Amino acid sequence: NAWEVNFDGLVGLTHHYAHRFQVSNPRLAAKQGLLKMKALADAGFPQAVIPPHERPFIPVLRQLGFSGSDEQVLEKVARQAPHWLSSVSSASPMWVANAATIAPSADTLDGKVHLTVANLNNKFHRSLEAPVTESLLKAIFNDEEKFSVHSALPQVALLGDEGAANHNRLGGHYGEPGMQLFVYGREEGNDTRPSRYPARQTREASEAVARLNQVNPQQVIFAQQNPDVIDQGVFHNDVIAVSNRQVLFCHQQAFARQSQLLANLRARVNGFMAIEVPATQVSVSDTVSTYLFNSQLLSRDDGSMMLVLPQECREHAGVWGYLNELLAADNPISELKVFDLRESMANGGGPACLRLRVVLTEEERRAVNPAVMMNDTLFNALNDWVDRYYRDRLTAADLADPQLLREGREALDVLSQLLNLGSVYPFQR
Amino acid sequence: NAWEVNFDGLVGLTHHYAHRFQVSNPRLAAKQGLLKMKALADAGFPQAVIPPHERPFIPVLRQLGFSGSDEQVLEKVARQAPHWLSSVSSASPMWVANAATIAPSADTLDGKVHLTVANLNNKFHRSLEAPVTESLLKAIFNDEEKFSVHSALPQVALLGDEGAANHNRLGGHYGEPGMQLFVYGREEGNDTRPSRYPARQTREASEAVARLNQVNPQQVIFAQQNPDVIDQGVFHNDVIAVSNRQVLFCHQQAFARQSQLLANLRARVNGFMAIEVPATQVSVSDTVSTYLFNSQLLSRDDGSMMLVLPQECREHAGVWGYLNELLAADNPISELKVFDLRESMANGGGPACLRLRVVLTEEERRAVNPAVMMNDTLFNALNDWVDRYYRDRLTAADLADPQLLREGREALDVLSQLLNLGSVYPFQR
Ligand SMILES: [K+]
Ligand SMILES: [K+]
Q: Which one of A413, B104, B182, B208 is least enclosed by Cβ atoms within 10 Å?
């Protein structure tokens, strides 16, 4: 039987702000993330980890015209065009919800697990991720008889893809064929689209990923996000809705043709249950500020569920009130769990943004690189690694420091050994 | 003694329309282009050629999720999503003015000729060109002691680059250090930008290419295109202005701060002469429909110049009238030459769009692959090749034909032998 395994992103050393804060705490950011990972693991929810990337990323600076040695390039950019430093030093890869789109073997035509890297074309600093993200996935899901990793879609606005963050999977047990729901923000020919915040996900992209992941045509549904919610701050579906098994926890203003979509899911998903949060109870604004929907909806063995939320949801009387009501109402959600993720939330990432859901059978679980599976040993090893290399204070100005560069290179080289990934980074090649 | 050599694009076999004409004539399109090439060569203007690309381009269709053999992929796309066929079968590479940005050795810090491939990120069908365009340039400008080809900038809207079409070079003799003028349509932070037709060229990209091409900082000027002209159809600078030696032939509504730009050129370029066409005489509309500014401004040995224009300029009484006046006025232009380029103009390409200007010293000219330099032998060989493989009629519907695919592959394989390029195309690797 298959279980849903969460793969979380280990915050990188250059985590920074580019709130009125300019000083970040990389070390604390990583520790907060590790704590969430460990807690869930300890509670019985399969957990794994995905490492940070090479930052600053000098290769793209060379692509931009700066030549010399890594340190000279860094110096030239610092002196001539320092704004690029921030753009090539983001710890954004930590939000693995955007790393790729997953298709469990129960939904594929060739019976293998498929993962398609997201190009993340809309944002320059995130578009840099794809190549390295592909290497990491291939080093983690290395067994080609069980896993199939596809390269990201062409890097153009027409095929903007933000991955799992806009993906959903509904059904009975995880191991059974499920219904996949792809949410997009825009499509060619459709005049209905955001007018203040461009849509990062296009239907053309979603459909291509569906194709690449060999998804059964009858087990896929494409739905357009409500354009008005996007203009309010919902840049990904995972900020206004989340799914798990037969449940779809969403805001009433989440989808363009919501009524139609839900009815369709009810007809196609056995026992499907939609939990819509009316705007009266919680507004879109409240949703965006608390990240109520960027929560993880987990399943226990008895069929009950747990909601993992960021601290902002508890600090908001209105949302907390709603959650306690939901807890007592007639539905699977029987527990609420809150985590302090201030560092990630400062840059726009909640509990779900930091994780990538991968349903794996018992045999597939065994095929995954064991060095990335969470347990006491990995937890302690990572914590020590963080205490050794991560700084407690960082600003954009420190990105020009050659020593930060050197520290990050050693750190990643040591981590690649710890996670048994080999020479997975560009600088190692 | 350096000369400016024109490298024209040989129209590909899939030239088609995706006016209301639906039937294209690939063969005629190629022959019209060859005729212009030959005429200029015969008149004494150094001329060379750049081959078409692999079309349909199946590899991108696979990236989009269609698997199987080349024929099956083609079949699946034709049946499932036929609109992709057109987007991967464009003969757009013919407009080599967008292939890359050139820096003559007289302007470079390392004394070599630099060529940076344009990403052409704005349009999906043209963004496919970069990789193959890079291989072709490296096979034509193969001597690395004389030429340096740099890969295209990252494929993101922030770094949209359309190449030479937005470039200009002013100065005395071609071989002397010249003043480079980079024209862009938008830049970050600048609220001044097109509002109807997105700007394909960003200042950030222009500046990066300037760096890649090792351009002397004092020999470069960045100027913003007038946003109002862009919204009227001027998607590239070579549709509203053209330079040559000490002359800059442009429309009065060409640049944002025109007065300041021209005064600056007057101060930095000896003998600089700006020929501004007032709106009263020729409107922007007239400009866009006739392609008056997408003309080639050539130099003869005595210092006189010749304007190479598309038929549309002669057919427009107003523009033709202005040209005759310009010919008699006090300036270097002493001759007008018109060519029939209806096929290319049908898709938005005039004489200049079909050519890439490369200033080369005598030694550099000798270093260029001799097999692509224009002469009677190459001219006759190419015309025969065209007659053998090009169809007289074509529509988007024919792009699904496996036989057209096979014809194009053999044609390109034979052409690669004729032009002594080796296995330069993906299908040959
Ligand atoms: K409940
Ligand atoms: K004249």
A: A413
